[PDB]
Amino acid sequence: ARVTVQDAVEKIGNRFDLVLVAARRARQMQVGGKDPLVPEENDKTTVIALREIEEGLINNQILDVRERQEQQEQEAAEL
Amino acid sequence: KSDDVNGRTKMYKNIVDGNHQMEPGMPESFNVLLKEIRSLGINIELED
Amino acid sequence: TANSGYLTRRLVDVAQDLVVTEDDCGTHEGIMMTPVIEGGDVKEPLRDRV
Amino acid sequence: SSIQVKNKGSIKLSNVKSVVNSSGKLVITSRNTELKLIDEFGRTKESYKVPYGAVLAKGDGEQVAGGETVANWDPHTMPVITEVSGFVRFTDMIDGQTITRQTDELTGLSSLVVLDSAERTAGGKDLRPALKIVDAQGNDVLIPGTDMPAQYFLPGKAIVQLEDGVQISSGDTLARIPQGGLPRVADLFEARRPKEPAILAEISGIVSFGKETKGKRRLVITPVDGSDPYEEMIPKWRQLNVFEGERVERGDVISDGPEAPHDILRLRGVHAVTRYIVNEVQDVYRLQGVKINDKHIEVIVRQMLRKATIVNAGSSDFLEGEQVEYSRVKIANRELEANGKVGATYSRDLLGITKASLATESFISAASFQETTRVL
Amino acid sequence: GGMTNLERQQILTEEQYLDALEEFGDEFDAKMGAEAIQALLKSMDLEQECEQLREELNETNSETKRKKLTKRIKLLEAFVQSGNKPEWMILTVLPVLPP
DNA sequence: TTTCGTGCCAATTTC
DNA sequence: ATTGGCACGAAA
């Protein structure tokens, strides 16, 4: 569970940017077909995203790289 | 949660489907205000 | 209560649009901070003002 | 009445124009004299105001101890003391035309009483009396550091104590002159003017009087350099606190009372007005034990200082005497300066929160706040 | 004003108007109501008024007159800069709110 | 004549 | 109630 977000804030550097990054990752895990990078323990996607950010597995650069890689793979395998 | 009529029905449908996202739109009271200001003979409009 | 509410509404209205939109402006101006002393008693030390 | 020092430390004097009397002590002849208690570390601890014409037991920089009276002055008397020592001779002072003869019934020690233009004869309206200091040879004694002859004018309701032909010295009184809460914060932020605002000096230089009983009294200020003599129209019933032929500086106290923030901004600047507002608000809040940072009051004051008035168009397109945004003026001037041209010249304006919030560039916000019909 | 000594904005009365009719005849025009105000607003030229007011402002010296002329020139220039016309402040058609 | 004093009128007052 | 701005009249 979550009681504080201080570690994730120090990982990202901003609360305002942390909210956006966590929302992006949580929407990927909720509506998309993504799987969590940490073992989900009766948690919701927002808390899972916060825990992923806390361990350094998720940030804006990583999300952008993953999106570019997925788009490139889709365009390469479309033919 | 208010006078935006189409987003009201979109949000309920999204919540029932398990998608917690919204499409905000324009409040209705602002349109009422525009009509009431136009009824005074003042040309007020949105541009671009 | 009503007077306090009216005062705070006016204060909100005058300054609502002020946001931190930068990191440094390069200015060299400033205010000189000195301890607040009235008569024979130091009302406020310098530490809490800087 | 007297200044009672609390702790032990060195004494510092600021803005002092003082002279040594016959008794050897020091008498201050400056209006803006401030007394500070600076200790060995050099930190100010006590601050007091020493009124014009006061007696100091200790000099500037002398060591003092706790519980010591350093200053003493008469609160009900305004001295008109001189600087040089010599005999007193009257000039342009005639009994029954400018003054009166009223002798005390019991004490028996009194002299001619100086009257005002509202009491003297018409012929005395064009006469300006004075007292001149002379020596045993009859020549005028010059004040050290100055070239003008030392003669002092006398205002109305002045009670002379020493008759003609009596020796005086420096520091001697020629004559005696007889004399919060939520609404406070709301008035401070609305920048209201007080009922009896303190009158300041618009321009520095020598001071003098003008035509008397012209509906209201007149004051003239002629700067040391060649400049236009300013005109002040101080209405009577107000106790003027400046003699004729006195050097004054712009933004200095002439009459007494609360000082309007607009005058402070016009004559002293932006830092002065912001610190005045901060000090007043914090004084109101500290009585109740409320702790608020100064950042918030500073941002409110900044939002109050959002308008400027153009004094001349220059090379810009701003019409003279119009009210515009300070940021717009800065942007236009920095754009014209980079082209080698000349920008405009402006003066900051101070508005209350209600007036400043109705002068915003967005009409939606102004209509939301209040007075929708006028804004629309 | 016509050929007579009447000004372009002088206020008359019923008796004065009848006297002017019986003396001068049809040489002058006088009206009452919002039609007269609309005629006055329609017949004024903003550029000429601005130029005349600017000249009169830069001619003489005063304090209150300067502020009044500044206000009037500000209003005239505000009307000039935008596409608005002075006679649009008199209503000939009235909007009706949706039911 | 120009400047200043004085009366009239509008807009404000919590949730 | 209070405050601010505008018209009106009276002062030098």
Query: Between D294-304 and C2-15, two packed helices, what is the crossing angle to 10 degrees?
Result: 70
Determine the distance between D348 (CA) and G1 (C1') in angstroms: 33
- HEC string for E25-84: CCCCCCCCCHHHHHHHHHCCCHHHHHHHHHHHHHHCCCCHHHHHHHHHHHHHHHHHHCCC
Bridging pattern class, strands D112-114 and D86-91: unpaired
Cβ contact D28:D11 at 8 Å: no
A31 touches chain B (CB under 8 A): yes
Mutate to test the interface with D, among C4, C8, C10 (most CBs of D within 10 A): C10
Nearest CA in chain D to C50: D294
Give the experimental resolution in Å.
Answer: 2.8
CB contacts of B21 in chain A (<8 Å) are 27, 31
User: Which nucleotides of chain F have an atom under 7 angstroms from any protein CB?
Assistant: 2-5, 11-15
Q: Which residue is listed with tokens 């200015």? A: C27
Cβ contact D76:D124 at 8 Å: no
Q: Do D365 and C16 touch (CB under 8 A)?
A: yes
Q: Do E95 and B39 touch (CB under 8 A)?
A: yes
Determine the distance between E76 (CA) and F11 (C1') in angstroms: 27
Structure tokens at D58: 């200790």
Could you tell me which residues of C are annotated as the binding site? 25
Could you tell me which residues of C are annotated as the binding site for Zn(2+)? 25
Residues 6+ apart with CB under 8 A from D367: D375, D376
Confirm whether any atom of chain F, the nucleic acid strand, is less than 7 Å from CB of D214. Answer: no
Cβ contact E67:E57 at 8 Å: no
CB contacts of E94 in chain B (<8 Å) are 41
Q: Which SS3 state, helix, strand or coil, does residue C43 take?
A: strand
Using the 8-state DSSP alphabet, how is residue C16 labeled?
T
Could you tell me the residue ranges of all domains in chain A?
1-79
Q: Are 3 or more Cβ–Cβ pairs between E and A shorter than 8 Å? A: no
Nearest CA in chain E to D321: E70
Nearest CA in chain D to C33: D275
